[PDB]
Structures are given as structure tokens and as C-alpha cells.
Design an enzyme around this catalytic site. Structure first.
Site, PDB file in Angstrom:
ATOM      1  N   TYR A  49       0.779  -1.176  -0.051  1.00 40.23           N
ATOM      2  CA  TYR A  49       0.147   0.151   0.034  1.00 40.23           C
ATOM      3  C   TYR A  49       0.824   1.175   0.044  1.00 40.23           C
ATOM      4  O   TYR A  49       1.934   1.213   0.399  1.00 40.23           O
ATOM      5  CB  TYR A  49      -0.864   0.165   1.252  1.00 40.23           C
ATOM      6  CG  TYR A  49      -0.291   0.403   2.356  1.00 40.23           C
ATOM      7  CD1 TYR A  49      -0.005   1.619   2.892  1.00 40.23           C
ATOM      8  CD2 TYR A  49       0.293  -0.741   3.381  1.00 40.23           C
ATOM      9  CE1 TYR A  49       0.591   1.887   4.219  1.00 40.23           C
ATOM     10  CE2 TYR A  49       0.729  -0.576   4.355  1.00 40.23           C
ATOM     11  CZ  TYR A  49       0.996   0.790   4.952  1.00 40.23           C
ATOM     12  OH  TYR A  49       1.696   1.054   6.150  1.00 40.23           O
ATOM     13  N   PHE A  71       2.138   9.739   2.996  1.00 39.00           N
ATOM     14  CA  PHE A  71       2.490   9.492   4.784  1.00 39.00           C
ATOM     15  C   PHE A  71       2.986   8.034   5.002  1.00 39.00           C
ATOM     16  O   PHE A  71       3.260   7.957   6.148  1.00 39.00           O
ATOM     17  CB  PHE A  71       1.117   9.827   5.482  1.00 39.00           C
ATOM     18  CG  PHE A  71       0.060   8.823   5.554  1.00 39.00           C
ATOM     19  CD1 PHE A  71      -0.966   9.278   4.755  1.00 39.00           C
ATOM     20  CD2 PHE A  71      -0.023   7.600   6.184  1.00 39.00           C
ATOM     21  CE1 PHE A  71      -2.226   8.369   4.638  1.00 39.00           C
ATOM     22  CE2 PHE A  71      -1.101   6.839   5.987  1.00 39.00           C
ATOM     23  CZ  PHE A  71      -2.253   7.000   5.315  1.00 39.00           C
ATOM     24  N   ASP A  72       2.715   7.457   4.227  1.00 42.02           N
ATOM     25  CA  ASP A  72       3.222   5.908   4.235  1.00 42.02           C
ATOM     26  C   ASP A  72       2.886   5.007   3.408  1.00 42.02           C
ATOM     27  O   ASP A  72       2.322   5.093   2.548  1.00 42.02           O
ATOM     28  CB  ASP A  72       2.408   5.263   5.638  1.00 42.02           C
ATOM     29  CG  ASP A  72       3.116   4.039   6.175  1.00 42.02           C
ATOM     30  OD1 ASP A  72       4.349   3.630   5.863  1.00 42.02           O
ATOM     31  OD2 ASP A  72       2.419   3.243   7.154  1.00 42.02           O
ATOM     32  N   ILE A  93      -8.473  -0.106  10.104  1.00 41.68           N
ATOM     33  CA  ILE A  93      -9.510   0.846  10.220  1.00 41.68           C
ATOM     34  C   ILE A  93     -10.659   0.342   9.369  1.00 41.68           C
ATOM     35  O   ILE A  93     -10.590  -0.717   8.436  1.00 41.68           O
ATOM     36  CB  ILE A  93      -8.775   2.153   9.576  1.00 41.68           C
ATOM     37  CG1 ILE A  93      -8.393   1.879   8.164  1.00 41.68           C
ATOM     38  CG2 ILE A  93      -8.072   2.717  10.586  1.00 41.68           C
ATOM     39  CD1 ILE A  93      -7.854   3.490   7.767  1.00 41.68           C
ATOM     40  N   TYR A 127      -9.412   7.696  10.951  1.00 38.32           N
ATOM     41  CA  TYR A 127      -9.138   7.667  12.484  1.00 38.32           C
ATOM     42  C   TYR A 127      -9.730   8.778  13.143  1.00 38.32           C
ATOM     43  O   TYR A 127      -9.393   9.503  14.096  1.00 38.32           O
ATOM     44  CB  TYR A 127      -7.542   8.163  12.213  1.00 38.32           C
ATOM     45  CG  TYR A 127      -6.754   7.078  12.030  1.00 38.32           C
ATOM     46  CD1 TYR A 127      -6.384   6.918  10.725  1.00 38.32           C
ATOM     47  CD2 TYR A 127      -6.279   5.802  12.859  1.00 38.32           C
ATOM     48  CE1 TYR A 127      -5.345   5.939  10.205  1.00 38.32           C
ATOM     49  CE2 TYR A 127      -5.658   5.165  12.461  1.00 38.32           C
ATOM     50  CZ  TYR A 127      -5.118   4.867  11.222  1.00 38.32           C
ATOM     51  OH  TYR A 127      -4.481   3.930  10.555  1.00 38.32           O
ATOM     52  N   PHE A 159      -6.053   5.440  -0.009  1.00 40.05           N
ATOM     53  CA  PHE A 159      -4.846   4.501  -0.316  1.00 40.05           C
ATOM     54  C   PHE A 159      -5.075   3.672  -1.569  1.00 40.05           C
ATOM     55  O   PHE A 159      -6.048   3.657  -1.914  1.00 40.05           O
ATOM     56  CB  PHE A 159      -5.242   3.439   0.698  1.00 40.05           C
ATOM     57  CG  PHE A 159      -4.908   3.834   2.302  1.00 40.05           C
ATOM     58  CD1 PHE A 159      -6.171   4.188   3.010  1.00 40.05           C
ATOM     59  CD2 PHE A 159      -3.529   3.683   2.883  1.00 40.05           C
ATOM     60  CE1 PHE A 159      -5.792   4.613   4.287  1.00 40.05           C
ATOM     61  CE2 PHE A 159      -3.404   3.810   3.903  1.00 40.05           C
ATOM     62  CZ  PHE A 159      -4.434   4.537   4.928  1.00 40.05           C
TER      63      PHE A 159
END
Ligand SMILES: C=CC[C@@H]1/C=C(\C)C[C@H](C)C[C@H](OC)[C@H]2O[C@@](O)(C(=O)C(=O)N3CCCC[C@H]3C(=O)O[C@H](/C(C)=C/[C@@H]3CC[C@@H](O)[C@H](OC)C3)[C@H](C)[C@@H](O)CC1=O)[C@H](C)C[C@@H]2OC
Length: 102
Positions: free
Chosen positions: A16, A26-27, A46, A72, A89
Site C-alpha cells: 500500500y 504519509f506511508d 480501520i 482515524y 490508499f
């Protein structure tokens, strides 16, 4: 060609990349080339993942756009994710690991 597709309780191997609305990443699992492994539908992740990743074939990609109520919420996930944030994502299913016998 898709002999098996993801169902609740399956263990998925996934790559991902997560981005915020403004496009900033962010990741991601790709740089360290280490797929993320989780059980679908067990609440390990999530809600936007557990709900967005059913019926998937190995090799399939999906874009998930996740509103903060499925992510979140109002507290976010400091420092990488603010409260109230929409998450994007891009994901790819590499492998389905399913317990076959009783
Ligand atoms: C002890 C260490 C923590 C432990 C860390 C790991 C195993 C390493 C693993 C690669 C996570 C990543 O670590 C580099 C990193 O992934 C993010 O960057 C990210 O892209 C993300 O949003 N992901 C990851 C991929 C699946 C979706 C989502 C997630 O659902 O993640 C899950 C998540 C946070 C769920 C919370 C759990 C509590 C609920 O209350 C909340 O709310 C409902 C939802 C993660 C996987 C948890 O199951 C397990 C952990 O957290 C987070 C932004 C921050 C997170 O590190 C924290």
C-alpha cells in the site's frame, strides 16, 4: 483469472501507499518492500479497509478513498494523520492465505 477472492477471515498480503488529500504521501510498504499482512474483517485495521477490500483477486489493485469516520476520526493519528482527515490508499493484493481444513 481469479480462482479465489478475499472473504472475511482471510489473511491478506498487501502492498500500500497512503496519501493525504493534498497528495502528500504519509506511508508506504513499497520502499522497504515488505508487504503488510492482516486478517480481513476482524477489526485489525480501520473500517475503511475492512469494508473496502472484499471480493478481491490476487493481482488486483484498488484505490480507496476513506472518510475520517472510517479512518482515524477526530483525533487522527499524530504525527502523520490529522484529525478529520480523508485518506487515499492505493493497494495491491499479493496473496490470499486461507485456512482450508478444519
Ligand atoms: C504497536 C504498534 C502498532 C502496530 C503497528 C504495526 C503492526 C506496523 C504496521 C505496518 C502499521 C504501520 O506502521 C508503520 C503504520 O500504518 C499507517 O501508516 C497506515 O498507513 C495505516 O493507516 N494503516 C496501515 C495499513 C492498514 C491500514 C491502516 C491501519 O488500520 O493500521 C492499523 C491501525 C493503526 C489500526 C488502529 C488500531 C486502534 C484503533 O482504535 C484505530 O481506530 C479504529 C485503528 C495497524 C496496522 C494496527 O493494526 C497495528 C499497529 O498499529 C498508520 C497511520 C500508522 C501505523 O503505525 C501505527
Amino acid at each position: 483469472h481469479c480462482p479465489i477472492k478475499s472473504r472475511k477471515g482471510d489473511v491478506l498480503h498487501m502492498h500500500y501507499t497512503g496519501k493525504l488529500e493534498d497528495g502528500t504521501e504519509f506511508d508506504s510498504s513499497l520502499p522497504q518492500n515488505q508487504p503488510f499482512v492482516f486478517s480481513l474483517g476482524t477489526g485489525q485495521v480501520i473500517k475503511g479497509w475492512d469494508q473496502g477490500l472484499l471480493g478481491m483477486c490476487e493481482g488486483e489493485k484498488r484505490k480507496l478513498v476513506i472518510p475520517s469516520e472510517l479512518g482515524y476520526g477526530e483525533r487522527g493519528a499524530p504525527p502523520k494523520i490529522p484529525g478529520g482527515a480523508t485518506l487515499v490508499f492505493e493497494v495491491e493484493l499479493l496473496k490470499i492465505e486461507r485456512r482450508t481444513e478444519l
